[PDB]
Every structure is written in C-alpha cells, then in structure tokens.
Amino acid sequence: ERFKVVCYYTNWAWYRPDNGKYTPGDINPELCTHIIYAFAVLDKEELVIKSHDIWLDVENKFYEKVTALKSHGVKVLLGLGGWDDSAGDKYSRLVNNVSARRKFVVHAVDFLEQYGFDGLDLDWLYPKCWQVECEKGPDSDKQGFADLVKELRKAFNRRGMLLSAAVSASKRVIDYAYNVPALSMNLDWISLMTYDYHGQWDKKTGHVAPMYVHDKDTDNTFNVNFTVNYWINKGADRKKLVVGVPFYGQSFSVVEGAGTGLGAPTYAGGEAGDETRARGFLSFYEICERVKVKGWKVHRDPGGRIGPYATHDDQWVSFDDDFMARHKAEYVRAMELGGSMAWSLDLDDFTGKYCGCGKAPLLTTINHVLRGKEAPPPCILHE
Ligand SMILES: *[C@@H]1O[C@H](CO)[C@@H](O[C@@H]2O[C@H](CO)[C@@H](O[C@H]3O[C@H](CO)[C@@H](O)[C@H](O[C@H]4O[C@H](CO)[C@@H](O)[C@H](O)[C@@H]4O[C@H]4O[C@H](CO)[C@@H](O)[C@H](O)[C@@H]4O[C@H]4O[C@H](CO)[C@@H](O)[C@H](O)[C@@H]4O)[C@@H]3O)[C@H](O)[C@H]2NC(C)=O)[C@H](O)[C@H]1NC(C)=O
Ligand SMILES: CC(=O)N[C@@H]1[C@@H](O)[C@H](O[C@@H]2O[C@H](CO)[C@@H](O[C@@H]3O[C@H](CO)[C@@H](O[C@@H]4O[C@H](CO)[C@@H](O[C@@H]5O[C@H](CO)[C@@H](O)[C@H](O)[C@H]5NC(C)=O)[C@H](O)[C@H]4NC(C)=O)[C@H](O)[C@H]3NC(C)=O)[C@H](O)[C@H]2NC(C)=O)[C@@H](CO)O[C@H]1O
C-alpha cells in the first residue's frame, strides 16, 4: 500500500513464438498493485482513444480479461500512446485545442468505463519533443498537456478513476515537456521511464539504465539517480514518483577490434532474439538463454553504478539483472518514492524456464523489496 508496483502488460506479446507468448492468463496479480494495458492509440482524425488491436482487445476480450483482475485487488488502467503511436502531431493538435481536449475527456471516461478500466495512463512520448525530437513541437505543448491532465483529473475525480503518466528520463526533454509541479499535483503517480539512456542510436556500447554516474560517462545526467533527483528538484512529490526498471537489454554489434568495453563503437543493433524478433534489444529471458546455453560472458561493474552487460563475438547487450533490480527497488524505499514500474511483464523470465530463478524473477525481486514478499536470493547469472 505504501509502495506501488506498476506493471505494464503489452497486448502484442500475444503475437510471439510459444515460448515468449504472454496472454492475460499469464499475469500473476499478486505481483502488481497496478496493471497498465499497453497500448491504446489516439485516432488521428477524431483525437479520441481507440483500440490499436480490435481483434485482441475487443473481439478476444483481452481488455476485459485484464480488467477482470481487479477482483484480486489490482487496479487496472489503460495506457494511451507509447513510442510508436507518439509519431506526428496528433497529440499536440489535441492538447493545443480546447474543443478537442473537452471532447477527448468526455469520450475517454466512457471508453474506460465500457471495458472496466479503473483509469488512464498517459504515454505521449513526448510533449513538445515528439519522439525525442525537441525541435518539432510548439513550446505550448507543455501547457496543453498540463491542461489536459488537469481537465482529466477533475473529470476522473467525480468517477473514482486513476490518472497517471509515463514520462521521459532525459533532463532536456523534461525541461521542454513537463510542468513538473502541475503534473505531480494532478497525477496519482508519475512513471519515470528511467531506461533507454543508451542504445544503438548512440553508436557506442552503453548501459540501458545506469543507476549512478560512471566515470566513462560523457553526460552525468544519463542515469536513474539524476532523473529522480531532478524531478524532485523541479518540484515533484516524492510519493508520486515511480521508478521504471527495464526487463530487457539494449543490444549492439561492435566494430571489429574495438573490444568489449563500455563506449566501444558499434555499427548496428545486435542480432534479433528468437522471441522478441527485434534487432537492438533482447528480453531478459533471451539474455539468460545466451548466458546459460550459449556461453555469453557477463561483465559487471564493481562500483555498482551500472547493471551488467553480456558479450559473445561482436554482440553486446546491457541489462539489469536481479541484483540491480533489487538495488533500484531498495533505492525507491530508501528515497521514500512512490514505487517501481516494470516494462514489461512479458520480457521478464515469467515462465521461469530460462533463467532458473523461479517464475518472474525480476518482478518477484521488486515485490520482495517494496511489498515484503518472501523470496529467494538474487539469481547469479554467471552461474
Ligand atoms: C545521487 O544523486 C544525488 C543528487 O545529486 C547525489 O547527491 C550528493 O550526495 C552526496 C552524499 O554523499 C552529498 O555529499 C555531501 O553531503 C553532505 C552535505 O551536507 C556533506 O556532509 C558531505 O560531506 C562528507 O563527504 C565528503 C565527501 O564527498 C567529505 O569530504 C566530507 O568531509 C564529509 O565526509 C564525511 O563523510 C564521508 C562519507 O561517509 C566520510 O568518508 C568522511 O570520512 C566523513 O566522515 C565523517 O563524518 C560523517 C558526517 O559528516 C560521519 O557520519 C562519518 O561517520 C565520519 O564521522 C558531502 O559533501 C552531495 O552534496 C550531493 N550532491 C548534490 C549536488 O546534491 C548522490 O551522490 C548520488 N548518489 C550516488 C550513490 O552517486
Ligand atoms: C538522432 C539521434 O541520435 N537522436 C538522439 C536520441 O536518439 C537520443 O534519445 C534517445 O532516443 C531514444 C529513441 O531514439 C529514446 O528511446 C525511446 O525511449 C522511450 C523511453 O522514454 C521508449 O519508450 C517506452 O519504453 C518502452 C521500451 O523501449 C517502449 O516499448 C516499445 O514499444 C513500442 C511500441 O510503442 C514497441 O514497438 C517496442 O517493441 C517496445 N520496445 C520494447 C523494448 O518493448 C514503450 O513504448 C515506452 N513505454 C511507455 C510506457 O510509453 C522507446 O521505446 C524508445 N524508443 C526507441 C526507438 O528505442 C530514448 O529515450 C532517448 N534517450 C534519452 C535519454 O532521452 C538522445 C539522447 O542522446 O540523443 C539524440 O541525439
């Protein structure tokens, strides 16, 4: 009750080879206080919420099958947006027009109630910095988003619905996008997306979610600790801040002869995993498979500032393991924040067959720290 564990469920994890396949029946409600159903999308024409996958969400009742878990004491919200749906100006057009916001709020309330959702989690990435491009949006996206949140807050309070938002971890995006005091006041929690600080786009090996500054770092703001303290210094309520932990790694293909170190030049994303089928990232269970069966070498930071990374040939993937996930959850408790967020349920070793540290090892670890679930010690991968 004191700490939230916000779990992102992704509907497209259904369209995955049997061993990676994740359905609403795979959710363990004991491991979440709040489930976010990712994603719904904004209709480009009407600027209202709509299903991104009618066949799954509606025809096969995946919306209702997830909101049905509220009988376990879990709150279930619909996530609107995500990275891919945040392309273009549709959300900016929405928040900069008073008539469109008003029609969005009225429709959103009934859309959510029609499927039994307890609320809405805003995942516009990002106000003003459309898909991280801060030159694209107007400076007024900041107030428009703030005003959309205020108007949703007042409309939701009369219905008992929850309102939250997933937000960037980048200092520069925060400055352009977020009225931090207004958002903290009007949102039930703020999910800091404290990951994807580094990836194939840097063209150098880096860690997906550094905890503290590392000496090889070029920028001392690209770490979880800065993001949290920055939101606090910008005026945020500690108890509203929810620290996101990635259940997946950023993978790279390193230029030949550049070594296996941090900051080694890369020419492409890593080879795709069998289940996630996406160059540039691997699920946690795919990383376990590579360490246990394929002999990938785990490299750790003795200073505890970043999680591990794994290597084989010119492949390189940085990720959070059980030890770093425990630390980030312990960091939330030590800092008295709102809780932890998991992206995403399906990228954890939810079956337990890959990592051999029980079912949902990463999520179990977080629940152990924040909610007192007795658990085994962290699993050592190298073993
Ligand atoms: C996450 O991001 C945060 C936000 O930016 C980072 O914030 C920084 O946090 C550090 C905390 O470590 C803070 O540092 C100052 O904290 C207080 C400010 O009021 C000062 O007292 C601190 O001085 C101590 O540390 C200095 C070294 O930096 C040292 O020179 C100074 O003399 C004093 O040393 C004592 O404590 C050391 C640490 O244990 C001992 O090694 C040393 O021997 C001294 O010990 C004696 O005194 C203690 C009481 O003072 C006593 O308890 C002890 O037992 C012994 O008797 C320090 O300057 C920064 O201000 C803060 N930065 C900002 C910008 O806010 C945070 O670091 C980051 N986390 C991580 C993990 O990276
Ligand atoms: C030109 C140039 O070099 N520009 C750089 C710029 O690239 C650097 O900024 C970094 O940009 C990357 C994008 O290029 C940013 O990465 C974003 O990060 C988002 C986090 O805020 C992340 O979205 C959330 O997290 C999930 C995990 O990635 C997302 O899941 C993804 O969902 C998709 C559907 O929408 C799906 O298709 C994907 O498969 C899925 N991926 C996984 C692993 O599951 C999720 O959508 C989203 N969650 C929520 C709740 O909304 C984006 O996914 C990610 N995109 C990409 C393309 O990777 C990164 O944040 C930027 N870094 C920083 C620190 O700001 C910038 C920094 O240097 O430098 C510019 O020069």
Numbering used by the authors: 2056 to 2438
Please share excerpts from the published article on this structure.
Here we report the catalytic properties and the crystal structures of the catalytic domains of OfChtII, the ChtII derived from the Asian corn borer O. furnacalis. Analyzing the domain structure of the predicted protein with the SMART tool revealed that OfChtII contains five GH18 domains and seven CBM14-type chitin-binding modules (CBMs). The other two GH18 domains (C1 and C2) are predicted to be catalytically active (CAD).
The 2Fo − Fc map showed clear electron density for (GlcNAc)5 along the substrate-binding cleft from subsites −2 to +3. The aromatic residues Trp2067, Trp2138, and Trp2256 interacted hydrophobically with the −2, +1, and +2 sugar residues, respectively. Additionally, all of the acetamido groups pointed away from their corresponding sugar rings, which suggests an energetically favorable conformation. In particular, the C2-acetamido group of the −1 sugar pointed toward the catalytic residue Asp2178, and the O1 and O6 atoms of the −1 sugar formed hydrogen bonds with the side chains of Tyr2250 and Tyr2303/Asp2251, respectively. The O6 atom of the −2 sugar formed hydrogen bonds with the main-chain amides of both Trp2138 and Asp2139.
